[PDB]
Structures are given as C-alpha cells and as structure tokens.
Amino acid sequence: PTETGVVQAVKVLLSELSVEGLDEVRRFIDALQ
Amino acid sequence: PTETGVVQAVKVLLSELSVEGLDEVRRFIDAL
Amino acid sequence: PTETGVVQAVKVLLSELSVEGLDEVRRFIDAL
Amino acid sequence: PTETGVVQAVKVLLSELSVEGLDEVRRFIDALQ
C-alpha cells in the first residue's frame, strides 16, 4: 500500500463526517506527531 | 457517512493491496 | 502503510455496508 | 454506515502514515469545517 492511495481514501471518508467525527479524528492526528 | 462514499474509499484502498490481502478481504465479505 | 493495517481498516468499513455495497466491493476485487 | 465505524477505520489508516501524509489530511479536515 502507498501513502498517496491511503490519503485519498481517508479524504473520501472524512468528507462525509459530522463535526463530532472530524474533531475526534483531528485529536487522533495530533497524537501521532 | 453514505454507502457510496464508503464503497468508493474501500475501492481506493483495495487497489493498493496484494493478492493475499484481497483474498482476506473477500473471505470477510463472505462472513457478512 | 502496511497491508495488515489497511486490511483491518477495510474490514471495519465493510462491517457497516449493506448487501448491495458488499456486492459492489466483491465485484471490484474480481477486477483486481 | 455509522460515523463511529468510519472514525475507527480512519484511525487505523492514519496511525501508519508519515508526517507528510498526516499533514495533508489535517489540511483537508480544516477545509471541512
């Protein structure tokens, strides 16, 4: 698997989510760096 | 989430997998 | 990305789909 | 599809990505709100 493809899939999934879900994902990303 | 978007994202992910991974996903679909 | 993680994520997504969506994903696997 | 399941899948995918990919995803999330 390539990062480019995974990023594209993640964008598709995120684009439909509510603010609640987006806020949860952002907190998780901030834990990864 | 809509089914259309999730299906689209899954297809993008599957296009990156090896035959082994594709076979594992196919078996899981059979479990559902 | 590792195949193991992507496969795991795909399974989580597939557990949410209807039969119609699962059938579409299965057909796509056949295309790969 | 439920948001909870999609969020869980997104977390699995993000957890493996490089800083480059994570940075791209974050910019995208900020566009969704």
Numbering used by the authors:
A (entry chain B), D (entry chain B): 259 to 291
B (entry chain A), C (entry chain A): 259 to 290
Sentences reproduced from the published study:
Cilia and flagella-associated protein 410 (CFAP410) localizes at the basal body of cilia/flagella and plays essential roles in ciliogenesis, neuronal development and DNA damage repair. CFAP410 is a bimodular protein comprising two folded domains, i.e. NTD and CTD, which are connected through a variable unstructured loop. All these three crystal structures show a similar homotetrameric arrangement, with each monomer consisting of two α helices that form an open nutcracker-like conformation. Two CTDs first form an intercalated homodimer, and two such dimers further assemble into a tetramer by packing head-to-head through their first helices.
The CTD truncations that finally generated well-diffracting crystals were fragments covering residues 256–295, 212–246 and 213–246 of H. sapiens, T. brucei and C. reinhardtii CFAP410 proteins, respectively. However, those of TbCFAP410 and CrCFAP410 only partially dissolved in the buffer. We, therefore, carried out refolding for the insoluble polypeptides using the following protocol. The final condition for crystallizing the TbCFAP410-CTD contained 2.0 M (NH4)2SO4 and 5% (v/v) iso-propanol (4°C). The crystal structure of TbCFAP410-CTD was determined de novo using ARCIMBOLDO. Our in vivo data showed that TbCFAP410 localizes to both the basal body and the posterior cell tip. We observed that the A267E mutant that breaks the tetramer into two dimers could still localize to the posterior cell tip, but failed to target to the basal body. However, the disease-causing mutant L272P of TbCFAP410 completely lost its localization to both the posterior cell tip and the basal body. It suggests that targeting TbCFAP410 to the basal body requires the tetrameric assembly of the CTD. Therefore, we conclude that the localization of TbCFAP410 to the basal body and the posterior cell tip requires the CTD and its ability to oligomerize.
